[PDB]
């Protein structure tokens, strides 16, 4: 309190400014000169009463000015309605907050006045008066509801609370202990006077005024007024219907990038049109960039805004592309002749050094044309297997594909004829995939050309894999997932000759970079000249002339002459071979010849012949993913010094300015990231400059601002690289602390191949770009409409969570910000469903609603978080012929514990493939074929899976080479997003198991009988669950709400507010229209009263027969009031029995209780009441309900019963329970037990209720 009061004092001291000069201000002097005011001298208490009664009269006049007869203002200013309001009466009772603020201020004022009126009547002493004024200014917020009306008033309360604290303890030392009274009200008085100083003119202004796309449209209106008002009347009557027609046409021609030109137009009005188009174009461009920068930062917006903004930036990028293609066609080729001849002869020397044989044309029958054509058609129908409803242009495509299936040889003849003859092609459409961060194109190709291009894609990759065209450092490969690429890269870093020995000044350099504008800077003529060396010239002309085609977007057509078309089938070859030409420019021919080795004995990826040719050059590790290069250097002292000297020769640095601008990893701490010593920074600048000098800028360009250099030396303890979405920090064992060996996840222990001891540690993290892409996917899931069912949203969430975790398996546990983001997005997804249930926010909501599987009627949600199942939610019940039995059965298991790590899976894969090799070697020599008996011990173990060995399509899938880069490039061809782009199930198998998750989910939620208590199953009269089925992926929202109604409509979910339905006794907590629409349909046509009267008539027919066995002389059915069936405050007797002579009665006991001792209080009249119940999950125990209703209705002066001896029978319809409590005469209890059993088994009204429940839930058996 001291620190906060000192905070307010420092703020008032800092925000102080001198007041502005003005005329001196006298309100009462101007009031005095008016003849309507008089002056007198009065006591303070009398004028204090006059002010508050005048304020009461003012508020009364303001209430009855609007003819509001139903609102009563108390004399302590409490405003209350006299009755229950209606819709229009709530509309006519909408005052401003200034009204209720003035109400509470006058309430405070009347408290302050009446505190002294209590004093001057002789009731209290002034010692008791000063305490009372002290309580008021301290507890304004507790005595008044003024805090709800102004929120900034919360500043004024706590300050007056803090001044409440200090004085008290400064008062409470010495002989003073505790108790009421200080009497120092001035400190609380000044603050509320200073508050009234600011609140006064706002309330005066309110009483004063009580008692007494558009900007562009206005700009266009001003421009049209400036045009039309200058022209005279005979031209005003003509150009009002002349300009407006072509005024939109000029804007449309600008939007379609059409040059606007019309004859017969004067030049100043043409310049005015050009100024109009230019101003609207600047407004539209700034609006489009502003709307993109709003939604980039995560601000929510309507979906139509995103749909329009995508088209706006699509048109702007089309105008930019038509500009840059015209710039290429005007400026000529950007490449010189000498660079082209240099890279041409470089490719010639590399193909002569490897003795490569060129890929020929398939002459008549390659005897594998059918397999490649079937694989191409399966890749074309791979995208169309998602949905079963397609458009007409796609139905034509599937018809052409099925005609290619039915007649394959004619299709092959058409493909070969289009290869040998066709050079002109149809126009390719363009669309954009709406990622929130990065715009990405998707191309649309004619299907007859697409079949030919897909067969060309298959044939070219199948020939390129056979002829060994690509060296193994070109990545990705078919056999390696990218985390296995990261692991093999770390093992290649570890297994070098003395890579961590830096005792003599050695250095490690880890460069990572991206070829900037790799796809857009490929000259097609240069592509053809480099392509004619490896394939047929007709095939090269087919691949070259395909890129020179017109791209269309709906109004805009432009030819392509610079850059390749990335959406083609065979374009995945064009990416990979040309980058090998980059391998000849960065790595050099000698080092690439050392890495690739002899053609007669090629080396492995990150392997060499010997150690001498491995360490004879500093350039000793190299890798390239599709556009990102990753290079690793080992330097000595003298080579690094000479390289720094060669850098500082042309580029000196007198002020050491190369430190500012160095890219560094901010996700790691400062002791973890790169330390920027001057030698290491100069060495990194020298390395990047030496790599940049080897590439001609007209061919390709690397940039420092998108690159990264990590230097390991004596002054840097650790090495860093970003690769394949992974942040990796390598740290030596010998440069750190002792043996300790604490096991953590996200840590790869690195060991040597030869010595097999631990040498270094690799630390894994998820980079920022993957987390931002995941948050983009979460925001795309949060763009679901209100009519969308919950199960589709949960399925999209589960798809995104599997696509995150099954790629980032080990690295999620290491990073904590992603673990927080997952939980935050999970709570947002759950809140999206909780708002869709009811608009009011519930206090609690069970997780068992979400995480119930779809087979049991739930959503089937996956879990990444710490969710606890509380007690008294795992208890269930059952009813049988001896009575009611209760039973009692924790955390929800998560996803990351049910997925294998990477390193143990790699070790297991190596072991099972070595064992498979040894068993295959023993099987060949013994003339034995391997079966499932020899491979049942290593089932679903290994990358790739062993399941691919026993597939029917071995000879078909064995001919599919180069599938991973095509699977990655599927995103440029299909408009949907592609999770699992890095894998394919037919080749690598299934890499996870999710049935244990469902098993532990069913086990952890208390079992099936524990789950089905929430699900309204016992109202459906199915004895088992296993014989049932759902009516058919998704569940509707009404059926979901009606299914989970026992656990939603509870007292502890929507606290306080409860209502009762009219014709039933159903209590609704809060209000849910989606459940009310089902409760009206099920309980229609007075079904509650029909069930009640049916049970009454059936029990009266029970008491009608067997008359002499109970000594009954008269059974009587009482005149039941039609509102008795649902009124629950009081009740009445339903069936009355008259004893013949006399009956003995017992003490009130339960229906299942057999310990009956009867008393001597013999009565003649006996009464039976029937009560129905609609319960929920926390309150459905019918025995204590019957006991509580009997003890309520027999011990009050509101219910009427003719006899003090009777029984109350309670039936729960939500779970179909029945019990009884009360007095019993001899022979009545087993009779009524068997009678209620026969009623609950054979009441036709209950059968109508249960069949309406089964019709509403759509659940059959």
């Amino acid at each position: 309190s001291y620190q906060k009061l000192l905070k307010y004092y420092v703020l008032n001291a800092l925000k102080h400014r001198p007041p502005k000069a003005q005329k001196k201000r006298y309100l009462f002097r101007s009031f005095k000169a008016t003849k309507f005011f008089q002056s007198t001298k009065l006591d303070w208490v009398e004028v204090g009463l006059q002010v508050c009664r005048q304020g009461y009269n003012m508020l009364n006049l303001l209430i009855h000015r609007k003819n509001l007869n139903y609102l009563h203002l108390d004399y302590n200013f409490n405003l209350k309605p006299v009755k229950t309001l209606t819709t229009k009466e709530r509309k006519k009772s909408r005052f401003g907050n200034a009204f209720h603020l003035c109400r509470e201020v006058l309430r405070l004022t009347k408290l302050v006045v009446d505190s002294h009126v209590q004093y001057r009547l002789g009731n209290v002493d002034a010692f008791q008066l000063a305490d009372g004024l002290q309580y008021i200014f301290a507890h304004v917020g507790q005595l008044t509801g003024m805090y709800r009306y102004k929120y900034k008033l919360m500043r004024q309360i706590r300050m007056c609370k803090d001044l409440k604290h200090l004085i008290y303890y400064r008062f409470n030392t010495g002989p003073v202990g505790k108790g009421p009274g200080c009497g120092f009200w001035a400190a609380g008085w000044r603050v509320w006077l200073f508050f009234m100083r600011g609140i006064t003119p706002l309330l005066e202004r309110w009483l004063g005024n009580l008692l007494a796309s558009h900007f562009d449209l206005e700009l266009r209106a001003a421009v049209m007024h400036d045009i039309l008002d200058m022209m005279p009347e005979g031209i005003k009557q003509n150009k009002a219907r002349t300009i407006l027609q072509h005024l939109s046409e000029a804007w449309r021609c600008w939007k379609a990038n059409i040059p606007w030109k019309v004859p017969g137009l004067p030049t100043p009005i043409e310049n005015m049109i050009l100024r109009y188009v230019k101003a609207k174009a600047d407004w539209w461009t700034n609006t489009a960039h502003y709307n993109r920068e709003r939604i980039r930062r995560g601000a929510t917006v309507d979906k139509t805004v995103c749909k329009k903004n995508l088209g706006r930036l699509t048109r702007l990028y089309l105008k930019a592309e038509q500009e840059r293609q015209h710039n290429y066609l005007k400026d000529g080729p950007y490449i010189t002749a000498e660079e082209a001849v240099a890279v041409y002869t470089t490719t010639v020397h590399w193909l002569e050094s490897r003795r490569f044989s060129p890929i020929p044309f398939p002459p008549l029958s390659y005897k594998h044309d059918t397999k490649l054509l079937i694989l191409a058609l399966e890749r074309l129908k791979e995208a169309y297997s998602v949905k079963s409803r397609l458009n007409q242009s796609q139905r034509e495509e599937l018809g052409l594909i099925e005609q290619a299936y039915d007649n394959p040889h004619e299709a092959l003849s058409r493909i070969k004829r289009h290869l040998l003859t066709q050079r002109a092609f149809k126009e390719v459409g363009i669309e954009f995939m709406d990622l929130y961060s990065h715009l990405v194109p998707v191309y649309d190709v004619e299907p007859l050309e697409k079949i030919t291009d897909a067969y060309l894609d298959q044939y070219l990759w199948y020939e390129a894999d056979k002829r060994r065209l690509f060296p193994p450092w070109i990545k990705p490969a078919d056999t390696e997932p990218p985390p296995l690429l990261v692991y093999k890269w770390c093992q290649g870093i570890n297994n070098l000759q003395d890579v961590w020995e830096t005792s003599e000044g050695e250095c490690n350099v880890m460069l990572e970079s991206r070829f900037e504008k790799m796809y857009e800077k490929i000259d097609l003529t240069l592509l053809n000249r480099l392509l004619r060396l490896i394939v047929d010239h007709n095939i090269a002309d087919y691949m070259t002339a395909k890129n020179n085609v017109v791209i269309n977007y709906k109004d805009m057509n432009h030819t392509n002459s610079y850059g390749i078309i990335r959406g083609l089938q065979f374009a995945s070859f064009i990416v990979q071979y040309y980058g090998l030409v980059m391998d000849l420019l960065v790595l050099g021919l000698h080092r690439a010849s050392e890495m690739a080795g002899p053609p007669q004995m090629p080396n492995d990826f990150l392997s060499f012949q010997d150690i001498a040719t491995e360490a004879a050059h500093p350039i000793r590790l190299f890798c390239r993913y599709i556009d990102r290069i990753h290079i690793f250097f080992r330097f000595t002292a003298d080579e690094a010094r000479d390289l720094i000297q060669r850098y500082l020769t042309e580029h000196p640095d007198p002020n050491n300015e190369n430190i500012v601008g160095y890219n560094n990893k901010k996700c790691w701490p400062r002791d973890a990231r790169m330390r920027l010593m001057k030698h290491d920074v100069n060495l990194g600048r020298a390395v990047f400059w030496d790599i940049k000098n080897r590439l001609p800028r007209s061919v390709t360009t690397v940039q420092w601002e998108n690159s990264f250099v990590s230097v390991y030396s004596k002054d840097n303890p650790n090495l860093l690289f970003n690769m394949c979405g992974f942040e990796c920090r390598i740290l030596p064992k010998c440069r750190t602390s002792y043996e300790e060996f604490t096991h953590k996840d996200g840590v790869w222990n690195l060991q040597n191949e030869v010595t097999k001891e631990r040498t270094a540690q690799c630390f894994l993290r998820v980079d920022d770009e993957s987390m931002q892409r995941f948050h983009n996917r979460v925001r795309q899931i949060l763009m679901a409409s209100g009519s969308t069912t919950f199960t589709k949203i949960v399925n999209k969430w589960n798809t995104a969570l599997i696509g995150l975790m099954t790629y980032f398996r080990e690295a999620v546990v290491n990073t904590q910000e992603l673990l927080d983001l997952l939980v935050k997005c999970e709570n947002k997804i759950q809140t999206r469903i909780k708002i869709g249930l009811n608009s009011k926010m519930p206090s609690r909501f069970p997780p068992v609603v979400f995480y119930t599987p779809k087979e049991l009627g739930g959503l089937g949600m996956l879990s990444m978080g710490h969710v606890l199942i509380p007690q008294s939610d795992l208890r269930w019940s059952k009813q049988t012929d001896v009575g009611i039995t209760h039973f009692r059965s924790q955390l929800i298991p998560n996803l990351y514990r049910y997925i294998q790590p990477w390193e143990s899976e790699f070790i297991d894969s190596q072991r099972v493939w070595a064992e498979y090799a040894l068993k295959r070697q023993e099987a060949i020599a013994q003339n034995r074929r391997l079966t499932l008996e020899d491979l049942e011990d290593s089932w679903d173990r290994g990358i790739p899976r062993i399941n691919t060995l026993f597939q029917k399509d071995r000879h078909t899938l064995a001919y599919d080479k180069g599938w991973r880069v095509r699977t990655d490039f599927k995103q440029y061809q299909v408009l949907k997003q592609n999770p699992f782009w890095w894998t394919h199930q037919r080749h690598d198998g299934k890499l996870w198991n999710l049935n244990n998750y469902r098993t532990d989910m069913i086990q952890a939620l208390g079992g099936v009988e524990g789950i089905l208590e929430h699900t309204l199953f016992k109202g459906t009269y199915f004895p088992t669950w296993e014989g049932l089925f759902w009516e058919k992926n998704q569940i509707p929202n009404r059926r979901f709400t009606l299914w989970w109604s026992p656990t939603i409509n509870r007292a502890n979910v929507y606290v306080g507010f409860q209502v009762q339905l009219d014709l039933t006794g159903i209590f609704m907590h809060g209000k849910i229209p989606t459940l009310k629409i089902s409760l009206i349909q099920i309980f229609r046509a007075h079904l509650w009263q029909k069930i009640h009267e049916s049970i009454v008539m059936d029990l009266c027919q029970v008491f009608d027969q067997e008359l002499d066995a109970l000594e009954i002389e008269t059974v009587q059915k009482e005149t039941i009031h039609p509102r008795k069936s649902y009124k629950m405050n009081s009740s009445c007797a339903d069936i009355l029995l008259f004893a013949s002579y006399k009956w003995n009665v017992s003490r009130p006991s339960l229906l299942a209780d057999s310990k009956d001792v009867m008393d001597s209080t013999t009565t003649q009249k006996y009464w039976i009441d029937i009560q129905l119940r609609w319960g929920d999950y926390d309150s459905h125990d019918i025995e204590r309900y019957a006991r509580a209703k009997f003890l309520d209705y027999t011990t009050d002066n509101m219910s009427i019963y003719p006899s003090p001896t009777g029984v109350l029978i309670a039936i729960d319809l939500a779970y179909n329970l029945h019990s009884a409590y009360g007095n019993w005469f001899p022979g009545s209890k087993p009779l009524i037990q068997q009678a209620m059993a026969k009623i609950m088994k054979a009441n036709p009204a209950l059968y109508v209720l249960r069949e309406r429940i089964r019709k509403g839930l759509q659940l059959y058996s």
Binding site: H866, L935, E936, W939
Partner: peptide, 28 residues
């Protein structure tokens, strides 16, 4: 326990990643 999914930061001490993960038997 008002819903409120909690963060997994610091709430794993004895729980590994490979634990409670099972594989399937070969079908038929």
């Amino acid at each position: 326990p008002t819903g409120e999914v909690l963060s997994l930061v610091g709430k794993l001490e004895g729980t590994r990643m490979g634990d409670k993960a099972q594989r399937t038997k070969p079908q038929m």
